[PDB]
Design an enzyme around this catalytic site. Structure first.
Site, PDB file in Angstrom:
ATOM      1  N   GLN B  27     -97.495  75.730  10.315  1.00  0.00           N
ATOM      2  CA  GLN B  27     -96.521  76.674  10.862  1.00  0.00           C
ATOM      3  C   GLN B  27     -95.823  77.465   9.763  1.00  0.00           C
ATOM      4  O   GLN B  27     -95.719  78.692   9.851  1.00  0.00           O
ATOM      5  CB  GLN B  27     -95.497  75.953  11.741  1.00  0.00           C
ATOM      6  CG  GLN B  27     -96.109  75.057  12.793  1.00  0.00           C
ATOM      7  CD  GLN B  27     -96.082  75.708  14.163  1.00  0.00           C
ATOM      8  OE1 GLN B  27     -95.425  76.744  14.369  1.00  0.00           O
ATOM      9  NE2 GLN B  27     -96.824  75.129  15.101  1.00  0.00           N
ATOM     10  N   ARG B  47     -91.267  70.968  -1.578  1.00  0.00           N
ATOM     11  CA  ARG B  47     -91.435  70.040  -2.684  1.00  0.00           C
ATOM     12  C   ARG B  47     -92.698  70.381  -3.476  1.00  0.00           C
ATOM     13  O   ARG B  47     -93.644  70.963  -2.934  1.00  0.00           O
ATOM     14  CB  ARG B  47     -91.516  68.601  -2.178  1.00  0.00           C
ATOM     15  CG  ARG B  47     -92.785  68.271  -1.397  1.00  0.00           C
ATOM     16  CD  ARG B  47     -92.700  66.877  -0.787  1.00  0.00           C
ATOM     17  NE  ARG B  47     -93.838  66.578   0.078  1.00  0.00           N
ATOM     18  CZ  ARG B  47     -93.974  65.450   0.769  1.00  0.00           C
ATOM     19  NH1 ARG B  47     -93.041  64.511   0.697  1.00  0.00           N
ATOM     20  NH2 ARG B  47     -95.043  65.258   1.531  1.00  0.00           N
ATOM     21  N   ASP B  81     -90.903  66.441  12.065  1.00  0.00           N
ATOM     22  CA  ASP B  81     -89.678  66.005  12.736  1.00  0.00           C
ATOM     23  C   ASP B  81     -89.004  64.856  12.006  1.00  0.00           C
ATOM     24  O   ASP B  81     -87.793  64.893  11.759  1.00  0.00           O
ATOM     25  CB  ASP B  81     -89.966  65.576  14.174  1.00  0.00           C
ATOM     26  CG  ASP B  81     -90.584  66.680  15.020  1.00  0.00           C
ATOM     27  OD1 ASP B  81     -90.427  66.613  16.255  1.00  0.00           O
ATOM     28  OD2 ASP B  81     -91.244  67.590  14.473  1.00  0.00           O
ATOM     29  N   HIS B 106     -88.861  73.453  16.927  1.00  0.00           N
ATOM     30  CA  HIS B 106     -88.728  72.493  18.014  1.00  0.00           C
ATOM     31  C   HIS B 106     -87.317  71.918  17.942  1.00  0.00           C
ATOM     32  O   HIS B 106     -86.730  71.812  16.860  1.00  0.00           O
ATOM     33  CB  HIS B 106     -89.785  71.379  17.929  1.00  0.00           C
ATOM     34  CG  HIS B 106     -89.670  70.343  19.011  1.00  0.00           C
ATOM     35  ND1 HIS B 106     -89.827  70.636  20.350  1.00  0.00           N
ATOM     36  CD2 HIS B 106     -89.404  69.017  18.947  1.00  0.00           C
ATOM     37  CE1 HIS B 106     -89.668  69.534  21.061  1.00  0.00           C
ATOM     38  NE2 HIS B 106     -89.410  68.538  20.233  1.00  0.00           N
ATOM     39  N   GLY B 132    -100.019  76.614  13.998  1.00  0.00           N
ATOM     40  CA  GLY B 132     -99.953  77.533  12.879  1.00  0.00           C
ATOM     41  C   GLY B 132    -101.121  78.493  12.745  1.00  0.00           C
ATOM     42  O   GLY B 132    -100.918  79.708  12.772  1.00  0.00           O
ATOM     43  N   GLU B 193     -95.941  66.753  26.935  1.00  0.00           N
ATOM     44  CA  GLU B 193     -96.929  66.113  26.067  1.00  0.00           C
ATOM     45  C   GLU B 193     -97.097  64.632  26.409  1.00  0.00           C
ATOM     46  O   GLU B 193     -98.212  64.101  26.358  1.00  0.00           O
ATOM     47  CB  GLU B 193     -96.555  66.310  24.590  1.00  0.00           C
ATOM     48  CG  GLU B 193     -95.185  65.835  24.207  1.00  0.00           C
ATOM     49  CD  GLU B 193     -94.616  66.475  22.922  1.00  0.00           C
ATOM     50  OE1 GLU B 193     -94.890  67.651  22.601  1.00  0.00           O
ATOM     51  OE2 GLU B 193     -93.852  65.789  22.239  1.00  0.00           O
ATOM     52  N   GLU B 229    -117.184  67.817  29.778  1.00  0.00           N
ATOM     53  CA  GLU B 229    -117.060  68.922  30.721  1.00  0.00           C
ATOM     54  C   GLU B 229    -115.613  69.271  31.065  1.00  0.00           C
ATOM     55  O   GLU B 229    -115.393  70.201  31.843  1.00  0.00           O
ATOM     56  CB  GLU B 229    -117.851  68.590  31.988  1.00  0.00           C
ATOM     57  CG  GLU B 229    -119.296  68.283  31.648  1.00  0.00           C
ATOM     58  CD  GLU B 229    -120.136  67.908  32.836  1.00  0.00           C
ATOM     59  OE1 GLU B 229    -120.569  66.736  32.888  1.00  0.00           O
ATOM     60  OE2 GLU B 229    -120.397  68.788  33.685  1.00  0.00           O
TER      61      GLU B 229
HETATM   62  N1  LIG Z   1     -97.840  70.491  15.934  1.00  0.00           N
HETATM   63  C1  LIG Z   1     -97.623  71.695  16.674  1.00  0.00           C
HETATM   64  O1  LIG Z   1     -98.558  72.268  17.204  1.00  0.00           O
HETATM   65  C2  LIG Z   1     -96.191  72.267  16.791  1.00  0.00           C
HETATM   66  C3  LIG Z   1     -95.929  73.242  17.708  1.00  0.00           C
HETATM   67  C4  LIG Z   1     -94.667  73.749  17.817  1.00  0.00           C
HETATM   68  C5  LIG Z   1     -93.659  73.277  17.002  1.00  0.00           C
HETATM   69  N2  LIG Z   1     -93.924  72.296  16.091  1.00  0.00           N
HETATM   70  C6  LIG Z   1     -92.865  71.844  15.244  1.00  0.00           C
HETATM   71  O2  LIG Z   1     -93.182  72.374  13.761  1.00  0.00           O
HETATM   72  C7  LIG Z   1     -92.556  71.570  12.933  1.00  0.00           C
HETATM   73  C8  LIG Z   1     -93.563  70.904  11.950  1.00  0.00           C
HETATM   74  O3  LIG Z   1     -94.169  71.906  11.156  1.00  0.00           O
HETATM   75  P1  LIG Z   1     -95.760  71.787  10.812  1.00  0.00           P
HETATM   76  O4  LIG Z   1     -96.575  71.833  12.074  1.00  0.00           O
HETATM   77  O5  LIG Z   1     -96.174  72.924   9.862  1.00  0.00           O
HETATM   78  O6  LIG Z   1     -95.996  70.404  10.086  1.00  0.00           O
HETATM   79  P2  LIG Z   1     -97.000  70.254   8.856  1.00  0.00           P
HETATM   80  O7  LIG Z   1     -98.248  71.096   9.122  1.00  0.00           O
HETATM   81  O8  LIG Z   1     -97.315  68.775   8.721  1.00  0.00           O
HETATM   82  O9  LIG Z   1     -96.277  70.840   7.521  1.00  0.00           O
HETATM   83  C9  LIG Z   1     -95.299  70.049   6.833  1.00  0.00           C
HETATM   84  C10 LIG Z   1     -94.780  70.836   5.651  1.00  0.00           C
HETATM   85  O10 LIG Z   1     -93.620  70.362   5.277  1.00  0.00           O
HETATM   86  C11 LIG Z   1     -93.795  69.772   3.800  1.00  0.00           C
HETATM   87  N3  LIG Z   1     -92.995  68.595   3.588  1.00  0.00           N
HETATM   88  C12 LIG Z   1     -93.109  67.339   4.084  1.00  0.00           C
HETATM   89  N4  LIG Z   1     -92.117  66.601   3.572  1.00  0.00           N
HETATM   90  C13 LIG Z   1     -91.382  67.396   2.752  1.00  0.00           C
HETATM   91  C14 LIG Z   1     -90.262  67.143   1.982  1.00  0.00           C
HETATM   92  N5  LIG Z   1     -89.429  66.013   1.720  1.00  0.00           N
HETATM   93  N6  LIG Z   1     -89.715  68.116   1.244  1.00  0.00           N
HETATM   94  C15 LIG Z   1     -90.266  69.361   1.251  1.00  0.00           C
HETATM   95  N7  LIG Z   1     -91.371  69.615   2.008  1.00  0.00           N
HETATM   96  C16 LIG Z   1     -91.926  68.625   2.759  1.00  0.00           C
HETATM   97  C17 LIG Z   1     -95.054  69.467   3.698  1.00  0.00           C
HETATM   98  O11 LIG Z   1     -95.482  69.435   2.259  1.00  0.00           O
HETATM   99  P3  LIG Z   1     -96.646  68.421   1.809  1.00  0.00           P
HETATM  100  O12 LIG Z   1     -97.977  69.068   2.090  1.00  0.00           O
HETATM  101  O13 LIG Z   1     -96.506  68.150   0.331  1.00  0.00           O
HETATM  102  O14 LIG Z   1     -96.535  67.124   2.576  1.00  0.00           O
HETATM  103  C18 LIG Z   1     -95.742  70.612   4.466  1.00  0.00           C
HETATM  104  O15 LIG Z   1     -95.856  71.731   3.696  1.00  0.00           O
HETATM  105  C19 LIG Z   1     -91.972  70.449  13.811  1.00  0.00           C
HETATM  106  O16 LIG Z   1     -90.667  70.631  14.075  1.00  0.00           O
HETATM  107  C20 LIG Z   1     -92.787  70.557  15.128  1.00  0.00           C
HETATM  108  O17 LIG Z   1     -92.029  69.909  16.225  1.00  0.00           O
HETATM  109  C21 LIG Z   1     -95.182  71.785  15.968  1.00  0.00           C
HETATM  110  N   LIG Z   2     -88.969  69.111  15.821  1.00  0.00           N
END
Ligand SMILES: NC(=O)c1ccc[n+]([C@@H]2O[C@H](COP(=O)([O-])OP(=O)(O)OC[C@H]3O[C@@H](n4cnc5c(N)ncnc54)[C@H](OP(=O)(O)O)[C@@H]3O)[C@@H](O)[C@H]2O)c1
Ligand SMILES: [N+]
Ligand SMILES: NC(=O)c1ccc[n+]([C@@H]2O[C@H](COP(=O)([O-])OP(=O)(O)OC[C@H]3O[C@@H](n4cnc5c(N)ncnc54)[C@H](OP(=O)(O)O)[C@@H]3O)[C@@H](O)[C@H]2O)c1
Lengths: 324, 324
Positions: B27, B47, B81, B106, B132, B193, B229
């Site tokens: 995202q 980070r 989250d 979210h 994303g 979900e 299917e």
């Molecule tokens: N899953 C879905 O389809 C969806 C849909 C709508 C809304 N959301 C919401 O989107 C949000 C999650 O975003 P996402 O989907 O992009 O998750 P993600 O793909 O797992 O991305 C996580 C990002 O945050 C970084 N991160 C993790 N821990 C960190 C820390 N202490 N300090 C700094 N950066 C850190 C990660 O870096 P690293 O790579 O180094 O770990 C990564 O770049 C949630 O609130 C979710 O509820 C998700």
């Molecule tokens: N969230």
């Protein structure tokens, strides 16, 4: 048991056969056009109407069901499930000859013995895992739709090669074939659509939408949270199973899936599914379906009108219209 | 309320705002790239790691989370989250100034008050109905992914225009926006979900697969009839609701849908869903999720290893490998 491909179709048993496709709807048009493009000798047998006209304008030699059957070595019956029996008794059976082969794309009438084909005539099946327009379009794009094949009675010794060559001709062997029996295809196919794909799924969505709207949540938002976003979930499962889907969704969604799935679909739900299966195996469902047709489809009539009045369908139509 | 579009975005409230995206996952990358192409001043805070210089390499001024927050007027938090709370307390909350705006995609941590943003800072939400890569892709192809927007607290009077202009900048206003509240987005989103899209769906499929394989049907065939299917079925519902789906399936499948759906998903199933909803509304599910994370995810760990061992997942992986 693993899947078979064009290299496993070792005899081109449709060579030199005249092929009648009975019907010219979704499957009929797809099977006939793919087979013709694969080089087979295909004619269409169908009643007067738009299917008859569409077949003629597509360049097929087009006859009555009776005349097409009389001319053919291989006859594939793609009339609707509830029409096939009466159409077979009146128009197809008098025009069969020993050594012919009769095919179907679903085993219902043969397995439950609403149709009995004479013992000197083969009965085979090619059952694509997709609707007719997909069977045609994937073929035109160079691949196909996977299919099951089966043989109910083998009079000539060629029924299995005929079945597999049919699958190859409609493009299914390009992607994968699975042998089965008429019994398993019918019972597993009826069970899957009733308990999971069609019945279970729509009833599950509807129950979720009702819980939300009855709790005071706006129905427009509820539509998105129980239906619209399902496509992306099922696409992931289709491509990579539960594992890939659960990797894509958030960790909160994933945790909720594991915790709340079993609260909703319980052991009792599984017992409900077993009762569904039993009524498929014992012929009760089959007789109920055919008896509803004989009565003028009164149950289907009420079901279809009730479905048209569903709030989720009204809200969904307006949202889909507001969304290109 | 019905959908809103680009014409309903009354004020270009992001004009002259310095925008920090926190995180560069699926995202974070999508939001920041789309806003940049829309014309906005975007920087990234994350980070050190391959996220940190993925962003570095895409030409984004990249900083710590602390320093990116310090520089920004609008801070959108796109971390997972269960990470957001400790990240916010340690890195974001000390670097906020009165009149900033904090965004989420979210509502979970704000609605359940695991995070509390100071009362002189706005809190908004843009929640695309997509992941994303799809939010980025559709924007590149001229349209976008529809989205919900909401405001949890409005200190400046600009929070809603900020939310809706964020929607516009990521492409969502091109296809449809729906205003909501943090409470409804969170509760309906968790419910959908859990009871339908993820939990209910995979549990239903698994129950069907179990009934078939325990009754003696081959798992390979069962996989096609309860899972493979489903994509075609859900695609049809996505395009035209139950009505379009039920037109395309055979008449036996459609009758079986109407008759057997309600035998499987009963009133008791609906009661089960109500209990799922209650535990979302009263905070029990949210506390369970957060507590599992604090204990080292022992429940998630056992769930994931159990899921990897499912028979349907082993069979499915093999069949998907045999089907390019
Ligand atoms: N899953 C879905 O389809 C969806 C849909 C709508 C809304 N959301 C919401 O989107 C949000 C999650 O975003 P996402 O989907 O992009 O998750 P993600 O793909 O797992 O991305 C996580 C990002 O945050 C970084 N991160 C993790 N821990 C960190 C820390 N202490 N300090 C700094 N950066 C850190 C990660 O870096 P690293 O790579 O180094 O770990 C990564 O770049 C949630 O609130 C979710 O509820 C998700
Ligand atoms: N969230
Ligand atoms: N739906 C699926 O996804 C699917 C998948 C696999 C297998 N199948 C099986 O395929 C078969 C159904 O084929 P279909 O989907 O192509 O059905 P269809 O699209 O509804 O078309 C039925 C064809 O049969 C014609 N027809 C109806 N009554 C007739 C009669 N007395 N005499 C001659 N022709 C008649 C119809 O002509 P008119 O236009 O004049 O009515 C039409 O051309 C069933 O066995 C089904 O179980 C379906």
């Amino acid at each position: 048991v693993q899947m078979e491909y064009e290299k496993d179709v070792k005899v081109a048993a449709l060579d030199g056969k005249k092929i009648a496709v009975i019907g010219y709807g979704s499957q009929g048009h797809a099977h006939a056009q793919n087979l013709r493009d694969s080089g087979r000798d295909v004619i269409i047998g169908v009643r007067p109407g738009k299917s008859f006209d569409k077949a003629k304008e597509d360049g097929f030699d087009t006859y009555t069901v009776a005349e097409a059957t009389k001319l053919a070595d291989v006859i594939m019956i793609l009339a609707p499930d509830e029409i096939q029996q009466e159409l077979y008794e009146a128009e197809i059976a008098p025009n069969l000859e020993a050594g012919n082969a009769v095919g179907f794309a679903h085993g219902f009438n043969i397995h439950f013995e609403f149709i009995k084909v004479p013992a000197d005539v083969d009965v085979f099946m090619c059952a694509p895992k997709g609707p007719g327009h997909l069977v045609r379009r994937t073929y035109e794009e160079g691949f196909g739709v996977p299919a099951l094949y089966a043989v109910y009675q083998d009079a000539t010794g060629n029924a299995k090669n005929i079945a597999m060559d049919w699958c190859k001709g409609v493009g299914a062997a390009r992607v994968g074939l699975l042998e089965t029996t008429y019994k398993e295809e019918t019972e597993e196919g009826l069970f899957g659509e009733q308990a999971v794909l069609c019945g279970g799924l729509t009833a599950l969505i509807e129950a979720g939408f009702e819980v939300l709207t009855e709790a005071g949540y706006a129905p427009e938002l509820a539509y998105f949270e129980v239906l619209h976003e399902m496509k992306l979930i099922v696409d992931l499962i289709y491509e990579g199973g539960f594992k890939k889907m659960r990797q894509s969704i958030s960790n909160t969604a994933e945790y909720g899936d594991y915790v709340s799935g079993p609260r909703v679909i319980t052991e009792q739900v599984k017992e409900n599914m077993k009762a569904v299966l039993a009524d498929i195996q014992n012929g009760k469902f089959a007789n109920d379906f055919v008896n509803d047709y004989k009565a003028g489809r009164p149950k289907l009539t009420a079901y279809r009108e009730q479905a048209a009045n569903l709030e989720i369908e009204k809200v969904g139509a307006e949202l889909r219209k507001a969304m290109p």
